Design an enzyme around this catalytic site. Structure first.
Site, mmCIF file in Angstrom:
data_model
loop_
_atom_site.group_PDB
_atom_site.id
_atom_site.type_symbol
_atom_site.label_atom_id
_atom_site.label_comp_id
_atom_site.label_asym_id
_atom_site.label_seq_id
_atom_site.Cartn_x
_atom_site.Cartn_y
_atom_site.Cartn_z
ATOM 1 N N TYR A 1 0.851 -1.184 0.000
ATOM 2 C CA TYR A 1 0.000 0.000 0.000
ATOM 3 C C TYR A 1 0.889 1.237 0.000
ATOM 4 O O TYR A 1 0.850 2.040 -0.930
ATOM 5 C CB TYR A 1 -0.952 0.005 1.203
ATOM 6 C CG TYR A 1 -2.142 -0.929 1.055
ATOM 7 C CD1 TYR A 1 -2.046 -2.258 1.433
ATOM 8 C CD2 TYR A 1 -3.359 -0.481 0.542
ATOM 9 C CE1 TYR A 1 -3.121 -3.123 1.307
ATOM 10 C CE2 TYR A 1 -4.439 -1.337 0.412
ATOM 11 C CZ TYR A 1 -4.311 -2.658 0.801
ATOM 12 O OH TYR A 1 -5.355 -3.541 0.690
ATOM 13 N N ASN B 1 -11.949 2.510 -6.414
ATOM 14 C CA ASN B 1 -11.646 2.284 -7.820
ATOM 15 C C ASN B 1 -12.945 1.910 -8.558
ATOM 16 O O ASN B 1 -13.602 0.951 -8.188
ATOM 17 C CB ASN B 1 -10.572 1.194 -7.940
ATOM 18 C CG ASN B 1 -10.323 0.739 -9.369
ATOM 19 O OD1 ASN B 1 -10.749 1.368 -10.333
ATOM 20 N ND2 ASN B 1 -9.620 -0.385 -9.505
ATOM 21 N N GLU C 1 -2.887 -14.914 -12.027
ATOM 22 C CA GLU C 1 -1.780 -14.260 -12.717
ATOM 23 C C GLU C 1 -0.511 -15.039 -12.463
ATOM 24 O O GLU C 1 0.370 -15.141 -13.322
ATOM 25 C CB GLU C 1 -1.605 -12.824 -12.219
ATOM 26 C CG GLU C 1 -2.885 -12.010 -12.267
ATOM 27 C CD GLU C 1 -2.652 -10.533 -12.069
ATOM 28 O OE1 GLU C 1 -1.631 -10.156 -11.386
ATOM 29 O OE2 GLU C 1 -3.515 -9.773 -12.605
ATOM 30 N N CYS D 1 -6.822 -2.776 -8.530
ATOM 31 C CA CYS D 1 -6.742 -2.582 -7.079
ATOM 32 C C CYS D 1 -6.308 -3.900 -6.467
ATOM 33 O O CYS D 1 -5.672 -3.905 -5.429
ATOM 34 C CB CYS D 1 -8.053 -2.105 -6.447
ATOM 35 S SG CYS D 1 -9.524 -3.031 -6.906
ATOM 36 N N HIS D 2 -6.623 -5.010 -7.133
ATOM 37 C CA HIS D 2 -6.279 -6.349 -6.629
ATOM 38 C C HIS D 2 -4.796 -6.676 -6.477
ATOM 39 O O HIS D 2 -4.456 -7.541 -5.686
ATOM 40 C CB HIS D 2 -6.960 -7.456 -7.451
ATOM 41 C CG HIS D 2 -6.405 -7.640 -8.827
ATOM 42 N ND1 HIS D 2 -6.797 -6.868 -9.897
ATOM 43 C CD2 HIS D 2 -5.527 -8.543 -9.319
ATOM 44 C CE1 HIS D 2 -6.166 -7.274 -10.985
ATOM 45 N NE2 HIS D 2 -5.394 -8.296 -10.663
#
Lengths: 164, 161, 164
Positions: free
Chosen positions: C94, C117, C152, C125-126
DNA sequence: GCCATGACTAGTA
DNA sequence: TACTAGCCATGGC
């Protein structure tokens, strides 16, 4: 070891102990269930206490005359002993107890000790809260803790406070 | 404000401030340099000392500082300055020392925001467990600087333990 | 404002925007509902963006070719812009983001900006996490957060990760 | 007056 | 080791 489930405004309470002495007092769906090894259904058990709890919710009680067997770590013990310090309607913080019992800077350690409380209500793990003044957690639901606190300032049915 | 980058065992140090008064000291890839003008002749008093430090000879800085930051940060940083060379304190100990006991995590972040590395010995603060727990320009640098001040001799080598 | 709602492995997603430019994209029971004022349904809408999302969930697509119109604070735009920095399969703390838009100390502040978002995947944002390593919170639950991050990591459908 | 933070700290499985 | 019913200072909102 004998056990008995009575009804309550916050749902079924299950008391347990030896003869006339409580070892446990838990709720439906609260974290850390003890192993209930060698437990026996006894409908007539703990009649003294059973009466007193009913009174508590009914408004008419504030101090609990009952016999207790608290079994757990000396740190855990020292904490739980302090919890009974806390009078009816008053509140202390996590931080404040860590002081009272001489473990300064153990404000969090209490976090665990409260949750492993084996005897809810009578030993008041609900009367301990954050230094800002927020309910941080409760074994049996944050809302239930709230209902138990809102009982103690205004004698307001937990039946109600509970759905807010 | 005018600024200058120099070398060290741990890679480029950028010093910055105004006249001869030091506002910042930032090492590479650390945790907004607007209106800054590069002036390679500045802070030579400071730079001298910073070499001496790394040579393991200097153990007490002699520079003028300008420590802009919140009240609670001042108080922390000021407290950093009392930690002698080659000693260390816990985030707890500092918390206590500035009369805000049980804030030590917060000390962590104020410590994070040190605008002037090394000279403000923020790297000498550690976990009560003796753990390093983090540093702005990496943990491995922290270890290096601490090892240096222990040995009064170059620990260039400690960067790759 | 058009919108189109499509199916996905993490539950149906809803895309809205003007003509061919995307203003929102959101999931079910996502935190911070926006008002759907003057939204009208267009089931042929955004077919570019759609065919990309299916490919993103198949683990094939890795970078989205899409026109966005973001709306929010001076700050919120700084953060969201900082998010399209983060490459597929990497993360940032963050506060790390805080530093990268030159505002150290504002970690907890970037907290909210993600919360808000409007476009949930395409603007990731993930991919933003607590430095502890632990992943702090997500619009449609961590379940969903976790799943995407694992997608991912594997270049492989992670539609079971929801249940982990 | 809210919070999807973080270079802490203290006891248990 | 790595878990928490915690804590205190933040910076946006």
């Amino acid at each position: 070891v004998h056990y008995r489930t009575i009804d309550s405004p916050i749902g079924p309470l299950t008391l347990a102990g030896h003869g006339s002495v409580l070892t446990n007092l838990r709720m439906l769906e609260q974290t850390y269930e003890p192993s209930r090894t060698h437990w026996t259904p006894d409908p007539g058990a703990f009649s003294g206490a059973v009466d007193q709890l009913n009174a508590y919710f009914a408004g008419e009680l504030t101090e609990f005359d009952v016999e207790l067997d608290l079994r757990g770590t000396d740190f855990q013990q020292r904490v739980w002993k302090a919890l009974l310090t806390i009078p009816y309607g008053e509140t202390r913080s996590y931080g404040e107890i860590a002081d009272q019992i001489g473990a300064p800077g153990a404000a969090r350690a209490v976090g665990l000790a409260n949750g492993h409380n084996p005897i809810a209500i009578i030993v008041p793990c609900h009367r301990v809260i954050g230094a800002s003044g927020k309910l941080t957690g409760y074994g049996g639901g944050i809302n239930r803790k709230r209902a138990l606190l809102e009982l103690e300032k205004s004698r307001a049915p937990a039946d109600l406070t509970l759905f807010d």
